Amino acid sequence: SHMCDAFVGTWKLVSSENFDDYMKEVGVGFATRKVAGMAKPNMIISVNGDVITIKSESTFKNTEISFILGQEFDEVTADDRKVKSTITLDGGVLVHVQKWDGKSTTIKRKREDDKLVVECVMKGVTSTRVYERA
Ligand SMILES: O=C(O)[C@H]1CCCC[C@H]1COc1ccccc1
Numbered sequence: 001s002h003m004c005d006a007f008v009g010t011w012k013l014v015s016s017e018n019f020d021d022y023m024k025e026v027g028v029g030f031a032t033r034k035v036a037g038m039a040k041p042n043m044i045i046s047v048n049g050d051v052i053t054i055k056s057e058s059t060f061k062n063t064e065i066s067f068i069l070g071q072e073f074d075e076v077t078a079d080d081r082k083v084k085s086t087i088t089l090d091g092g093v094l095v096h097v098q099k100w101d102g103k104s105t106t107i108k109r110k111r112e113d114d115k116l117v118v119e120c121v122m123k124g125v126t127s128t129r130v131y132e133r134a
Contacts, residue, residue, distance in 0.1 A: 017128045
């Protein structure tokens with residue numbers, strides 16, 4: 001058993017709060033905000049050795065990242081930003097920092113009860129997205 005066991009599985013979005021305002025703060029344009037805001041993604045997390053994979057599948061876009069903790073990688077986000085990402089484990093929370101254009105956003109993923117809680121922060125703006133097992 002190991003590092004991210006409690007994250008692994010297939011998860012479905014059940015609630016979102018403040019996501020439009022997070023996207024605005026990130027710089028996402030009107031049409032993408034509207035369409036992306038409607039999506040109810042499935043997030044699929046798996047681990048093979050040191051490599052963690054997080055897939056998001058939805059009507060808007062499918063994305064996939066594979067990474068080693070602490071090791072920077074290039075990511076194309078659902079909204080089409082070209083970012084440089086680093087993901088670490090900090091006290092049982094996956095902490096994902098994305099850098100692009102002199103800007104930065106941090107996404108935290110944590111297990112709380114039977115949920116996977118995703119908190120997205122851009123300057124002073126936080127969005128909380130809650131997932132349940134699919
Ligand atoms: O819900 C999540 O896991 C978060 C991850 C961090 C970026 C914001 C969210 C993803 O947002 C998406 C919206 C529409 C389609 C695909 C992803």
